[PDB]
Design a protein around this ligand. Structure first.
Ligand SMILES: [Zn+2]
Ligand SMILES: [Zn+2]
Lengths: 257, 51, 238, 100, 48, 62, 97
């Protein structure tokens, strides 16, 4: 992703579905006047890797008129993965494969004049470049919905933007949205994880409270003679003698207590 | 009877359509074409082994 | 005897049987009273039709059950007289309210059970108005004329020949069936014209005719005159 | 996932097709017969068929030894089995994948 | 049928359709029938 | 628009079967049948090859 | 080694591919049309016979859709009263779908 002459140039990597075969493209125009991205027909055989899931290289192989770039003058081939340099997410095209006669982009020496259409812009961070204020906004095809020459704050002003970000005291400032961040290892330690049920995943973390039938006699004996040790199932309760009760997310490796 | 029937049979278009049951015998041999899930030399079940 | 112990057949329509001591006992412990909240007659804002379908004479006779004693959900099986087709049956109110259950004849009222109103077929009053007079007269003949001409409704008709009453199907009488359903017998129209007892004689006329002409009868005749560009496959005979 | 693995949602199936009927020489006299109340399913069995181990090979439309089914509709016609009906004739299979 | 050596083995040893002969025999199944040899073919004492 | 790994640009004079689309030869049922069977088992053979490369032990690969 | 019996000639069949035959085709046995969607069958039956063949599946599907738009047009406004004690339920359409 870089700028020149008013438009974007992006490096990308075309790939078969199994990522067996690959082609780098250095400077490609990002042009949102193409409904679908166009490649030279010759690559169709270069990118075809016949795996197990796709016995023939591609899932979709057909013929389309494809007169948009310049009666079946081209071929729709899918799905070919595409990795653009900026983005973390692969974008999956079903591109137009065009022969020399239909359209020939040899345009300058060694230069193949490839470009990226809205096929691939819809799937990237590049899409946010398509909204008002972005760098592709100038190149959108003319609409009732898209005003060409308006200043940004004019446009957003019509959509209801009034002041700058969090400028009025009534709206909380963005960075107090997250104040504390919880990381067990850095503070207070891990939780004490118990279960009542079949597994850790099938049961509740909770023990049963003091009000249980079987716990009442025990808890009684435990309140009256506090110092001697007492038999019972009243041990399994959430309530007990010690100041530290058993309830979920006790931090037991914490220094205090 | 045979003749009238052949006539009105050949006249209808829903015929001239292959009938898997009427037309052939899939397999004439008493043993199967490939091994399906029968106990092994060790006595282990079909589910316990891959051929 | 022995065979008395056998459980009856329970076809697909019918739910739980309650034929065993285990199946009877827990419901035996339910005792209903009719309060103001349970009484059918209070609820006529909704269930008015259900109220006008009850046999008020017969239920109090046979069952000793008053009409003011009948709950909207009542489990007891009481007698009904259908206000559409006019046939009598015995069911519980609970089953007519919880889902719609009612006279068994009006189940087949529409031309197909699977799709209730999906018919595009005209009523009987239109397609074959000459049928409406052959219906045995219970006074409901204006409701029965309203049905689809394709309807599978089982209706009773007074036979032309002997003036007695038999029971056949509306669509069997007209002969017309809806696209995608099963074809009836090609002759069904001529054959249901009369009683099952009166039908033989008239339909044996054309056969005697055809053995009078050629001195020989084969059922083939119709198909033959059906005979007096069909795409066909390539064959492997060669 | 949907863009990258299009073939994981099946969009294709073996079409339900009507079989040609065998000629009845007895003519109209018997024509009533095969036309009846119900549907009649017939699944084949034998030494080469009905084995769960081989199931997909047996439902595979490419295989010519493929297990044969047929259905008589109440109007008397015959058609091939819908895929559900085909699968009814194997011991019930449980598919659950816990991975996502 | 999943726990049992299949039937066809007895054909593979004695020839195909060999038992149809045996089934028409005078004294059959009281108690005894012409012995039916089914043993997994990798265990055959004869060949292996 | 510089391209790496793509060898001479625009390949060399190769049209797809469907696009070029020479008039379909009418084979007798013989020709067609045989085409179907040989290319069916051609695909079968390929599937085999791939499965064998998938299942190859590491020592074999080294 | 060479004691005990001569080497069976059929052994040759391993080393020489010339001798691997199949006298017949796959379906020459009379099953050729098994695969409904094979090119061979499209060539044998021709297209209009294939139309005739799949008409039943076409009308299956049309039946599903027809039911669906009947239910939609019936229950579209969700609340009304369409019958004696019965009233519109969107839930009907939902579950059919
Ligand atoms: Zn009724
Ligand atoms: Zn009569």
């Amino acid at each position: 992703f870089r700028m020149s002459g008013g438009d974007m140039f992006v490096e990308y990597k075309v790939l078969s579905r199994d990522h067996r075969r690959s082609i780098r493209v250095e400077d490609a125009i990002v042009d949102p006047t193409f409904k679908r991205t166009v490649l030279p027909l010759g690559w169709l055989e270069l990118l075809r890797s016949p795996s197990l899931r796709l016995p023939t290289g591609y899932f979709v192989e057909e013929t389309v008129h494809v007169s948009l770039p310049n009666e079946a003058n081209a071929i729709i081939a899918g799905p070919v993965v595409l990795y653009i340099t900026g983005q973390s997410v692969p974008v999956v095209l079903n591109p137009y494969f065009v022969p020399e006669g239909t359209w020939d982009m040899r345009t300058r020496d060694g230069e193949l004049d490839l470009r990226l259409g809205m096929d691939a812009i819809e799937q990237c961070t590049l899409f946010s470049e398509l909204r008002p204020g972005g760098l592709l906004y100038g190149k959108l095809p003319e609409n009732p919905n898209v005003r060409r020459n308006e200043s940004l704050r004019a446009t957003l002003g019509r959509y209801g933007m009034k002041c700058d970000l969090a400028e009025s005291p009534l709206v909380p400032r963005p960075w107090t949205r997250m104040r504390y961040m919880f990381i067990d290892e850095l503070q207070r330690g891990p939780k004490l994880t118990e279960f009542v049920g079949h597994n850790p995943r099938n049961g509740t973390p909770w023990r049963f409270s003091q009000n249980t039938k079987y716990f009442r006699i025990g808890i009684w004996r435990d309140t009256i003679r506090r110092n001697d040790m007492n038999e019972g199932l009243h041990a399994h309760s959430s309530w007990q003698k010690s100041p530290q009760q058993s309830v979920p997310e006790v931090r037991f490796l914490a220094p205090y207590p | 009877f045979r003749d009238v029937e052949e006539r009105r049979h050949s006249r209808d278009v829903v015929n001239e359509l292959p009938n898997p049951w009427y037309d052939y015998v899939a397999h004439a041999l008493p043993f199967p074409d490939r091994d399906a899930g029968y106990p092994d030399e060790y006595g282990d079940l079909g589910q316990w082994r891959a051929p | 005897s022995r065979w008395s112990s056998v459980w009856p057949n329970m076809r697909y329509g019918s739910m739980f049987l309650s034929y065993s001591v285990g199946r009877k006992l827990p419901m035996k412990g339910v005792n209903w009273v009719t309060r103001d909240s349970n009484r059918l007659l209070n609820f006529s804002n909704r269930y008015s039709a259900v109220i006008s379908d009850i046999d008020v004479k017969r239920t109090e006779e046979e069952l000793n059950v008053a009409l003011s004693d009948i709950r909207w959900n009542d489990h007891r099986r009481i007698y009904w007289k259908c206000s559409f087709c006019g046939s009598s049956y015995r069911k519980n109110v609970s089953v007519r309210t919880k889902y719609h259950a009612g006279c068994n004849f009006c189940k087949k009222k529409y031309p197909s059970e699977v799709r209730g109103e999906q018919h595009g077929s005209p009523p009987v009053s239109q397609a074959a108005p000459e049928l409406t007079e052959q219906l045995v007269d219970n006074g409901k003949r204006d409701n029965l004329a309203t049905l689809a001409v394709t309807s599978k409704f089982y209706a009773e008709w007074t036979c032309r020949g002997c003036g007695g009453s038999y029971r056949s199907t509306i669509r069997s009488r007209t002969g017309q069936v809806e696209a995608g359903q099963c074809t009836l017998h090609p002759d069904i129209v001529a054959w249901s014209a009369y009683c099952p007892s009166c039908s033989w004689r008239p339909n044996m006329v054309p056969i005697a005719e055809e053995v009078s002409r050629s001195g020989q009868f084969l059922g083939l005749e119709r198909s033959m005159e059906e005979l007096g560009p069909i795409p066909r496959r390539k064959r492997l005979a060669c | 996932y949907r863009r990258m693995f299009p073939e994981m949602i099946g969009r294709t199936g073996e079409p339900v097709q009507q079989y040609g009927q065998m000629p009845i020489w007895a003519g109209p006299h018997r024509q009533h017969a095969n036309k009846s109340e119900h549907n009649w399913m017939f699944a084949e069995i034998g030494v080469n068929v009905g084995h769960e181990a081989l199931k997909k090979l047996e439902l595979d439309p490419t295989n010519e030894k493929r297990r044969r089914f047929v259905i008589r509709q109440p109007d008397g016609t015959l058609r091939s089995a819908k895929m559900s009906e085909m699968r009814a004739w194997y011991w019930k299979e449980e598919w659950a994948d816990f991975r996502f | 049928d999943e726990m049992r050596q299949p039937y066809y083995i007895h054909e593979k040893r004695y020839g195909i359709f060999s038992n149809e002969r045996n089934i028409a025999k005078a004294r059959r199944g009281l108690p005894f029938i012409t012995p039916l040899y089914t043993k997994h073919m990798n265990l055959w004492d004869t060949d292996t | 628009a510089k391209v790496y790994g793509a060898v001479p640009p625009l390949g060399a004079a190769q049209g797809h079967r469907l696009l070029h689309g020479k008039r379909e030869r009418e084979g007798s049922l013989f020709a067609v049948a045989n085409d179907v069977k040989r290319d069916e088992r051609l695909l079968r053979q390929q599937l085999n090859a791939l499965l064998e490369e998938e299942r190859m032990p590491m020592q074999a690969r080294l | 080694l060479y004691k005990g019996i001569p080497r069976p000639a059929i052994t040759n069949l391993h080393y020489e591919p010339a001798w691997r035959y199949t006298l017949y085709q796959a379906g020459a046995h009379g099953a050729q049309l098994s695969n409904p969607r094979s090119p061979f069958t499209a060539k044998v039956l021709g297209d209009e016979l294939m139309q005739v063949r799949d008409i039943k599946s076409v009308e299956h599907c049309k039946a599903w859709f027809d039911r669906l738009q009947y239910l939609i047009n019936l229950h579209y406004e969700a609340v009304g009263d369409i019958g004696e004690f019965k009233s519109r339920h969107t839930r009907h359409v939902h579950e059919f779908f």
